[PDB]
Design a protein around this ligand. Structure first.
Ligand SMILES: COC(=O)N[C@H](C(=O)NN(CCC[C@@]1(O)Cc2ccc(cc2)C/C=C\CNC(=O)[C@H](C(C)(C)C)NC1=O)Cc1ccc(Br)cc1)C(C)(C)C
Ligand SMILES: [Cl-]
Ligand SMILES: [Cl-]
Ligand SMILES: [Cl-]
Lengths: 99, 99
């Protein structure tokens, strides 16, 4: 698709068999989702946002579908104001910025 | 142009007579820049992102140039860790996400 930016670029994602809404954020290096259960072991990561730093749980090699496009990558879980899809998965689905 | 998302999508902006580097952020509601002087009236604002909120000054009807494309809009100025161009100016230069 081509998505304009007059409204928030909110899309539907599917992870762990569940649908969620998430924001396509090209200012984000990483993908961060609100609290949820995922399989496997996790590693610690401290990430910084506009308000400061948070601790999150890092899960690697997680399947996730974004607007129907299949990706498999790193997902961070923790106290975020909204689910954000960052460049690590934007690049997997072939996203670019055009103007 | 077409901008790849393998790296952070940084561009040069011209604003208030100054040249600055800033991140094109499709998930950002607002444009927020590190401390700098701008002309005219302002009002304070709290803005939230990962890690919580910071207090900024809001200046409206500010001219800006982004990769050679002129626009005008609201610019927020405060202790942001990094300069972000949000959707309020990205729309004006005809920036879309495509995949
Ligand atoms: C390299 O570090 C990062 O990539 N950090 C990201 C990040 O915060 N990116 N920022 C870009 C903006 C992300 C976001 O768009 C996510 C984000 C999108 C949308 C919401 C909240 C957060 C929804 C709620 C309110 C609206 N708030 C926003 O739009 C705010 C605002 C424009 C006001 C700063 N937007 C954002 O906070 C830039 C940045 C880079 C380095 C550091 Br240290 C700190 C910040 C993530 C924490 C999301 C992974
Ligand atoms: Cl990844
Ligand atoms: Cl505006
Ligand atoms: Cl348009």
């Amino acid at each position: 698709p081509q998505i304009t930016l007059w409204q928030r670029p909110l899309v539907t994602i599917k992870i762990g068999g569940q649908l969620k809404e998430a924001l396509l954020d090209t200012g984000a290096d990483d993908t961060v989702l609100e609290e949820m259960s995922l399989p496997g072991r996790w590693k610690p990561k401290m990430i910084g946002g506009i308000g400061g730093f948070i601790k999150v749980r890092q899960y690697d090699q997680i399947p996730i579908e974004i607007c129907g496009h299949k990706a498999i990558g790193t997902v961070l879980v923790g106290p975020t104001p909204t689910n954000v899809i960052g460049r690590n998965l934007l690049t997997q689905i072939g996203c670019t910025l055009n103007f």
